[PDB]
């Protein structure tokens, strides 16, 4: 692997058949600077700092277009070779230390994710949860594969437990990772 | 049922070293999980990785305006975006929560840069053996976590502190714990 | 402000 | 966002050699381009310039580009070089669409 | 590289023309081009692989489409005397920031009363 001092991307260009669905997105040293709501129209920034730049969702719909028609090339150049389904890693854990009644944020990390198309929901006690949740954009690794992150703003209870529940192609049941303080 | 799907990917990926001086920028052309063509700055043209990449890398190695175009991204996208760099991402200090809870854990909570040094004194002596640290923990929100696990015994007179640093601090932040 | 890396079209 | 070519039109002798200047204060420049363009014909491709300090070549022609404007040096003009050359700019302020100046239109005297 | 057809055209006012446009082989990238004494060169519309990218200060009578051969189609209808101009065509490859345009030869239309 290349050894540097700051590894970024400007940008993470993505396209599939399923849907067809796109995503642009520009990552520096693994954290998402911002991406492009295609559907919306609108560039949506994850730091404070980085809100004032403008950057044209246009853009972001101009390059996905070349990806679009690359994919129909290189489908008819592999013979119409479909991305295998890869295992995702979920991990849950706390963002501070565990502390009864203070506010504290459950991530839910889902790792080696290919193709780039999961569902990440969250249950309290077994019922779903709708309500302070949010997620990340799918974040690109070297070995091309994805990598997505989901939060739960929360307040801990002594009998409140928390799940995560996953589902993607490559699993044959959703994925549970349980976790209680 | 598995769902027939075809993936593309593009990355434009610049490699900063040195600061301003060591300068490399690589695009990848990725068809699902298998990167069939490059460009890299230091080779200077677009190499074929895989079989699938001949038709690609050929193709825009021919044209001389397809190589000064790629070849300008270096300076037009590589250096033009440190410069935003340098006042924004690379500026961000956040300071890390450091908390001792119980053998013995050290709660390294929420920092930026990843840079991080952990260290656990036994009263003014340090302590290699039993430390079991966690990797980096990237939580995403851009903030880093780290935890650090002591097997201590807990003995009569000594203060058992984590000494923490950090590029956002000045001095080294110290948490301190008694038996 | 940012600038983006533009990707090569096939054939 | 604007592109601006000074003189509008230009008069010089065989030989007289001249430049052409090329203003703009468009945002986030990707690509500048010149043109030769003959009455009633289309325009003519002579080079591109992707970013300020380079430097292009084309026998008398010399299209160089800064953070401020480009020059299309023009050395021992015949009255071949007889034309409108136009310049154009390709950037993020403009959304990338091409915004061509008025021209300069050169006449070369025997 | 680029071609364009009719070369010359002479039409009365309230008449329908078409122009066509065969842009360069490899490049997916048509614009279009309006140019006059008092305007200059003007951008009409821009295509991209057969969808439209771009529009610029195009009249509603003058309408344009990118056939799946890559060749474009400018329709003028309800022709003023005014609309007497060079127009030209314009071929990029992808239609991105660094692409560079090549123009065609240009129809020439001359609306008369």
């Known amino acids: 692997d290349i050894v540097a001092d700051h590894v970024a991307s400007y940008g993470v260009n993505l396209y599939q058949s399923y849907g067809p669905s796109g995503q642009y997105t520009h990552e520096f040293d693994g954290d998402e600077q911002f991406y492009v709501d295609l559907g919306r129209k609108e560039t949506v920034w994850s730091l404070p700092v980085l809100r004032q730049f403008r950057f044209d969702p246009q853009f972001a719909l101009t390059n996905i277009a070349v990806l679009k028609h690359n994919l129909n090339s290189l489908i008819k150049r592999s013979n119409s070779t479909a991305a295998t389904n890869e295992v995702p890693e979920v991990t849950v854990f706390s963002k501070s230390p565990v502390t009864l009644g203070q506010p504290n944020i459950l991530i839910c990390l889902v790792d080696n994710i290919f193709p780039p198309v999961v569902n990440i929901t969250w249950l309290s006690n077994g019922h779903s949860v709708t309500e302070g949740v949010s997620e990340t954009s799918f974040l690109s690794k070297s070995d091309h594969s994805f990598f997505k992150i989901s939060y739960l703003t929360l307040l801990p209870s002594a009998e409140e437990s928390y799940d995560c529940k996953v589902e993607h192609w490559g699993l044959d049941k959703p994925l549970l990772k349980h976790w209680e303080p | 049922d598995s769902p027939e799907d075809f993936v593309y990917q593009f990355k434009g990926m610049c490699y900063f070293t040195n600061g301003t001086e060591r300068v490399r920028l690589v695009t990848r052309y990725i068809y699902n999980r298998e990167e069939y063509a490059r460009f890299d700055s230091d080779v200077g043209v677009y190499r074929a990785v895989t079989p699938l990449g001949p038709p690609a890398a050929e193709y825009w190695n021919s044209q001389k305006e397809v190589l000064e175009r790629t070849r300008a991204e270096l300076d037009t996208v590589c250096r033009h975006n440190y410069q935003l760099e340098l006042r924004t991402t690379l500026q961000r200090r956040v300071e890390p929560t450091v908390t001792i809870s119980p053998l013995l854990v050290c709660s390294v909570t929420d920092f930026y840069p990843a840079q991080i040094k952990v260290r656990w004194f036994r009263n003014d002596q340090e302590e290699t053996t039993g430390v079991v640290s966690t990797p980096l923990i990237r939580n995403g929100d851009w903030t880093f976590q780290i935890l650090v696990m002591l097997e201590m015994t807990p003995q009569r007179g000594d203060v058992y502190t984590c000494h923490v640093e950090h590029p956002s601090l000045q001095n080294p932040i110290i948490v301190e714990w008694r038996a | 402000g940012p600038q983006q890396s533009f990707p090569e079209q096939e054939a | 966002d604007q592109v601006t070519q000074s003189p509008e039109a230009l008069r010089l002798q065989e030989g007289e050699s001249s430049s052409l200047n090329c203003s703009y204060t468009?945002?986030?420049?990707?690509?500048l381009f010149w043109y030769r363009q003959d009455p009633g014909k289309g325009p003519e491709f002579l080079f591109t310039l992707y970013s300020a300090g380079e430097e292009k070549e084309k026998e008398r022609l010399k299209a160089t580009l800064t953070k401020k404007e480009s020059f299309l040096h023009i050395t021992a003009p015949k009255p071949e070089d007889s034309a409108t050359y136009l310049c154009?700019?390709?950037?993020?302020?403009?959304?990338?669409?091409?915004?061509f100046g008025r021209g300069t239109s050169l006449i070369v005297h025997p | 590289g680029v071609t364009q057809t009719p070369k010359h055209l002479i039409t009365a006012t309230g008449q329908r023309v078409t122009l066509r446009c065969s842009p360069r082989?490899?490049?997916?990238?048509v614009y279009w081009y309006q140019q006059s004494l008092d305007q200059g060169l003007q951008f009409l519309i821009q295509?991209?692989?057969?969808?439209?990218?771009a529009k610029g200060n195009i009249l509603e009578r003058f309408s344009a489409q990118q056939f799946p051969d890559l060749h474009s189609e400018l329709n003028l209808s309800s022709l003023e005397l005014g609309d007497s101009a060079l127009y030209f065509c314009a071929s990029s490859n992808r239609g991105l920031g660094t692409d560079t345009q090549y123009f065609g030869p240009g129809t020439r239309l001359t609306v008369l009363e």
């Open positions: 468009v945002s986030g420049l990707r690509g």
């Open positions: 295509y991209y692989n057969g969808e439209e990218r």
């Open positions: 082989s490899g490049d997916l990238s």
């Open positions: 154009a700019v390709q950037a993020s302020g403009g959304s990338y669409i091409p915004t």
